[PDB]
């Protein structure tokens, strides 16, 4: 995340971190239930074996709330295309169930039509992660969050050099220097309604991070709800 603020205690509890062999974060995930993590398909090629850490806010210290879980099943979307990042979504089934507790708790899945007419027409959602703090920079050691405005499909297509499919939506700022960035991918984009957070997107891609006239592109979770339901069995 470029810009934004730290997630304070208890504020981003649906966040998960995929960590490689070297115990280093390479991508985010969203907690869906005690066994299922939502992530981007493109993260599945950024390492050979990986685990999932939950409950972490500062990867430089063990505040005794963290847990690592091994992955049992990976369900990648069968139409993922690496060239365009279309169908950038995957579910992970964990070996052992998550224990919910402070900083660890799932985000809700919405109903499709209600989410489209009610959630995605709010002004903003929240994206969170441990990725880079600027394009050239290093990964954050603290979990960060950023409020990002939803952007008009039309404006976004005008702004992008790559094709924005119906499986994607854009969020972020034209000029303001605030955006997700590398390492944040696969992480949550959630939308608050009254006092509950629903998962609305997955951090997928951008042309750099926080560039003027570019936005962040997120997988449109609502196009995949049936598929997610299936995968969780």
């Amino acid at each position: 995340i470029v810009g934004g603020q730290e997630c304070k205690d208890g504020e981003c509890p649906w966040q998960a971190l995929l960590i490689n062999e070297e115990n280093e974060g390479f991508c985010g995930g969203t907690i869906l239930s005690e066994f299922y993590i939502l992530t981007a398909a493109h993260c599945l090629y950024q390492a050979k074996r990986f685990k999932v850490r939950v409950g972490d806010r500062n990867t430089e210290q063990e505040e005794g709330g963290e847990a690592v879980h091994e992955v049992e099943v990976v369900i990648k979307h069968n139409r993922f295309t690496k060239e365009t990042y279309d169908f950038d979504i995957a579910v992970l089934r964990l070996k052992t169930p998550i224990t919910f507790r402070m900083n660890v708790a799932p985000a809700c899945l919405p109903e499709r039509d209600w989410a489209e007419s009610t959630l995605m027409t709010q002004k903003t959602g929240i994206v969170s992660g441990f990725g880079r703090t600027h394009e050239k920079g290093r990964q954050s050691t603290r979990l960060k969050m950023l409020e990002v405005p939803y952007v008009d499909r039309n404006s976004c297509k005008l702004s992008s050099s790559f094709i924005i499919t119906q499986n994607m939506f854009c969020a972020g700022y034209d000029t303001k220097q605030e955006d997700a960035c590398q390492g944040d991918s696969g992480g949550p984009h959630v939308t608050r309604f009254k006092d509950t957070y629903f998962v609305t997107g997955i951090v997928s891609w951008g042309e750099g991070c926080a560039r003027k006239g570019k936005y962040g592109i997120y997988t449109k979770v609502t196009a995949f709800l049936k598929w997610i339901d299936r995968s969780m069995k």
């Binding site: 649906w14 507790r101 900083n103 708790a105 809700c108 919405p110 109903e111 209600w114 509950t196 957070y197």
Partner: protein, 54 residues
């Protein structure tokens, strides 16, 4: 002119669907619908969608 689900979410806490010409409310998994048919009551600690308070 805004009616049913389009008027402040049908007074529902979470999902709102217009069945016939009236509002039907419902709740995410891990919530139950209250007797007033509108509010959603968490059935455990750590319901989805809530920042953790302990």
């Amino acid at each position: 002119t805004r009616k049913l689900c389009s008027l402040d979410n049908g007074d529902c806490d979470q999902f709102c669907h217009e069945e016939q010409n009236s509002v039907v409310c419902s709740c995410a998994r891990g919530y139950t619908l209250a007797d007033n048919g509108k509010a959603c009551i968490p059935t455990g600690p750590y319901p989805c969608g809530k920042q953790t308070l302990e």
